[PDB]
């Protein structure tokens, strides 16, 4: 795929240890709002996503701590904010019914399918979604010109592989064919992150209502 790389990733030391490397669900949500405003994001736009997403995480964490509802580190879909601000715009978040499945397994239950077949919903069924699997969250999308892609706020090489080197950055990867993106996502989840065939993934389609 084609790649746009940020200059850094969410574990960068510029983020306070309070939020460092815990912001991915917020970064994925912020990405989908910014990408909806403009598909052709530049590297500096992804940097801005990481900055605003970290700020959102810190605000939500503070809110739940004042309410005594903070125990774990990565915010789940239930703890995501209901409103989000980009550069100049503000949106209410519409959470749609979640989809669940397994990376490769397809239990005889029948209802839940594997990742490849579940993500077929991106052809028309929906355009923007958060994808959580094995404690890692990414954003997946179908863009205005019918391309498929995802945004990964973790430490990645330009081609989307995990790296522990300080050269790793967040990346957005864009594909002409959905099948190519599915293969890449399986390389990420099962190759780089070593997640097993029976690992469950959680898909949250989101839409945005502009409130200026």
Residue numbers in the entry: 0, 300 to 321, 601, 323 to 510
Q: What does the literature reporting this entry say, word for word?
A:
To further elucidate the structural basis for VTD activity, we solved the crystal structure of DrT1-VTD2 (residues 300 to 520 of Uniprot entry A0A2R8QBC4) at a resolution of 1.90 Å and compared it to the ubiquitin complex of mouse cytomegalovirus M48, the only available structure of a herpesviral tegument deubiquitinase. The asymmetric unit contained one DrT1-VTD2 domain, which was completely resolved with the exception of residues 107 to 109 located in a protruding loop where Leu108 and Gly109 have rather weak density. In total, the structure contains four α-helices and nine β-strands, which adopt the form of an α-β-α sandwich, in which a bifurcated antiparallel β-sheet is flanked by α-helices. In VTDs, the catalytic histidine and aspartate residues form an invariable Asp-x-His motif, while in typical DUBs the catalytic Asp/Asn residue follows the His residue at a variable distance. As a consequence, the catalytic histidine (His453 in DrT1-VTD2 and His158 in M48) resides on the opposite site of the catalytic triad, creating a mirror image to the classic papain fold active site. To confirm the predicted role of Cys322, Asp451 and His453 as the catalytic triad of DrT1-VTD2, these residues were mutated to alanine and tested for their catalytic activity. Ubiquitin-AMC assays as well as incubation of K48-linked di-ubiquitin chains with C322A, D451A or H453A mutants demonstrated a complete loss of activity. When the DrT1-VTD2 residues 403–411 were replaced by a short Gly-Gly-Ser linker, the enzymatic activity against Ub-AMC and di-ubiquitin was completely lost. However, the quadruple mutant DrT1-VTD24mut (F398A, P405A, A406G and L407A) completely lost its activity against di-ubiquitin, suggesting a complex multi-factorial recognition of the ubiquitin Ile44 patch. Individual mutations of both residues (D376A and E377A) resulted in a strongly reduced chain cleaving activity, and also a reduced cleavage of Ub-AMC, the latter effect being more pronounced for E377A.
Deubiquitinating enzymes (DUBs) cleave peptide- and isopeptide-bonds downstream of ubiquitin. By performing a comprehensive bioinformatical screen, followed by biochemical and structural characterization of interesting candidates, we were able to identify active members of this family in a wide range of eukaryotic species and a few host-associated bacteria. Due to the similarity to the herpesvirus proteins, we refer to this extended enzyme family as VTD (for Viral Tegument-like Deubiquitinases). While some VTD activities resemble viral tegument DUBs in that they favor K48-linked ubiquitin chains, other members are highly specific for K6- or K63-linked ubiquitin chains.
